[PDB]
């Protein structure tokens, strides 16, 4: 486990706000996180576009199963590790590779669950605004520990621990160690 940030009672949210003049857009998305919790329903990682754009990326645990749901503009595509229980209290790592509409999810060394959506789907994640971790505002606060957040060449917890000028943690989210 890398830089471990804990989520205690009451929850919280850590936000990375991209600079207004340097908002990135990308065809392919990459995600990786090592989480430890027992919450049946929660939201761990949420990525939002700017104002007026419906594209979003959401990592959410529903009924104890973690899943990735992204809306790139046409429709929501959701992939879930349905045949696996993850909220056992241990440290579980997950990776999520996105390319166009296609998406692959890997858990530790367990077999990868892939998804190749049919039909015409959009491929661009337009003008990402903030990285949201904690999911309290959506309605599913996350209580647990998080480590090793990699997102398209960005290590969020690392530069959060490095006291970057565009990171804000509101709540009781404490650094482990």
């Amino acid at each position: 486990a890398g830089t471990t940030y804990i989520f205690s009672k009451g929850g919280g949210q850590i936000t990375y706000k991209w600079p207004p003049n340097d908002r990135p857009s990308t065809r392919a998305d990459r995600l990786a996180i090592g989480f430890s919790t027992v919450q049946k329903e929660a939201v761990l990682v949420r990525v939002d576009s700017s104002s007026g754009l419906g594209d979003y990326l959401e990592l959410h645990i529903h009924q104890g199963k973690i899943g990735v749901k992204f809306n790139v503009g046409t429709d929501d595509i959701a992939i879930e590790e349905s045949n696996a229980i993850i909220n056992d209290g241990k440290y579980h790592v997950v990776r999520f590779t996105r390319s166009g509409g296609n998406a692959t999810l890997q858990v530790d060394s367990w077999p990868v669950i892939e998804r190749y959506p049919a039909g015409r789907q959009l491929t661009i994640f337009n003008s990402q605004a903030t990285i949201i971790i904690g999911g309290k505002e959506q309605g599913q606060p996350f209580q647990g520990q998080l480590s090793g957040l990699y997102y398209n060449g960005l290590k969020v917890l690392n530069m959060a621990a490095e006291n970057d000028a565009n990171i804000a943690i509101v709540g009781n989210v404490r650094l482990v160690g």
């Binding site: 003049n21 908002r23 990135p24 857009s25 990308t26 065809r27 700017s50 754009l53 594209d55 503009g73 959009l122 491929t123 661009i124 337009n126 003008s127």
Partner: protein
Amino acid sequence: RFPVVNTAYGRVRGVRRELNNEILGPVVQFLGVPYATPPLGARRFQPPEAPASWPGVRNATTLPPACPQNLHGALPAIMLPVWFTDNLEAAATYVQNQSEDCLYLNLYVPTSGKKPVMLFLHGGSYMEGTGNMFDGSVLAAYGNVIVVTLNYRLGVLGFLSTGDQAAKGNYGLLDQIQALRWLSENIAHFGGDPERITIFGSGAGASCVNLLILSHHSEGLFQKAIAQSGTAISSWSVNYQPLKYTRLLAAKVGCDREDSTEAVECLRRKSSRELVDQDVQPARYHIAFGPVVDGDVVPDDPEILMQQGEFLNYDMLIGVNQGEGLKFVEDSAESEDGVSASAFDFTVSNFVDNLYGYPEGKDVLRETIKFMYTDWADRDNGEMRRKTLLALFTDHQWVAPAVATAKLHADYQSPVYFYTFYHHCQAEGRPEWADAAHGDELPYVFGVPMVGATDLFPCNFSKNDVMLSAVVMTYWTNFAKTGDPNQPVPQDTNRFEEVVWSKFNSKEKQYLHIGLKPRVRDNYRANKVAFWLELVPHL
């Protein structure tokens, strides 16, 4: 001296030509380095491949040969730049060494770290032009940037397609993408910056720039874009029925098979000169051979793709000139008075028939666009009807698509800077009533005023033109450096110092009015732009 720089495929020898003017530093020119394998035989009608390494040092001192073309034939004269149509002989002087082996590019290094790179995508249309006509040496010596002018396959050899898999098409776009890849992975050796590469072109070449934005092939190759007097949504930007003209050319050339693959092979068996000289006339205000919507380079029509945010946030600098349809009124441009009403109505009806031609309704559309484009305060002027016809062509073909694409690019929080050009070079044959026509900003961008009149531009350039050119290349080089035409270098030798260029917000369509008297204006021809974008679709 004769500086030698080692590339990733070999070593090249440049020159150190010194400019005529005084304040401009020496420029090192690597005229003629290659960037792809020459598509001569079986590789013809195929996407380009990486070049072949050479042993030793290769001369880069003479201008490379141009790609095959037919200047003295049947070309679309309505979309070509005015300075290219007027000086046809001086233009054909440059295209004399035409050969199928032409995939070469020229770099102009000057003599706050690595210098930015500016690629120039030339081409008034897709059937003519070469990169040797624009001596991008004053621009490099002024803005401390590296100007790169390329040569790509044009016309039949670069854009022939059948819609099928036998001939996908868009080989010119793939050549441009290969040149961008070569610049990205080789410009570090020349002192350039592979992370600040801009692409800027005029005319239909600028269309390529726009078509290079909606393509996943050019993802990280370039960072910015400057599309002047060109869009990917005008009538003559892409070709929507390529088979109808490919079959016509094949039939006229001698072999018209019913199978695409064997017809493509038969065409590959022909010589590069025989099929270039052949005359295939397209429908008016359209193109015969050009970019084709296939699914690989251009996934769908550029109008649909750019609406649903299929681009990767490129800083953009769009602009238009005031009157560009100067060749729309050319059959009635040498008269004491303008266009008589019996001819104004005829021209408008022909316009509607050629462009829209919608059988659903035309007696309503023709009347309303006749009524809109006439000044009723001076209805019986006659002379000021050429002005309204010129405005009609300029508004439909250039101003409206440029404003639409600027709004669409600015609706996804990507910077857009809009400019309008009013000043023009005072030529000899250019009419007094006419104003800045198509491609009449290229001399100012390239520093022609600061180097003297050339064979392509025979105008007399005063001190006003020199100052305007200095300011224009200052803006362009500032955009190349950082993406904001105001921050790097303050304006200096004037009304150009106190004007601050502002972004193009969709709600408040702010723009800058480049000319004798600049101003940051608020809305450009909002009435006619809104007419063409919001009313005509309802008729």
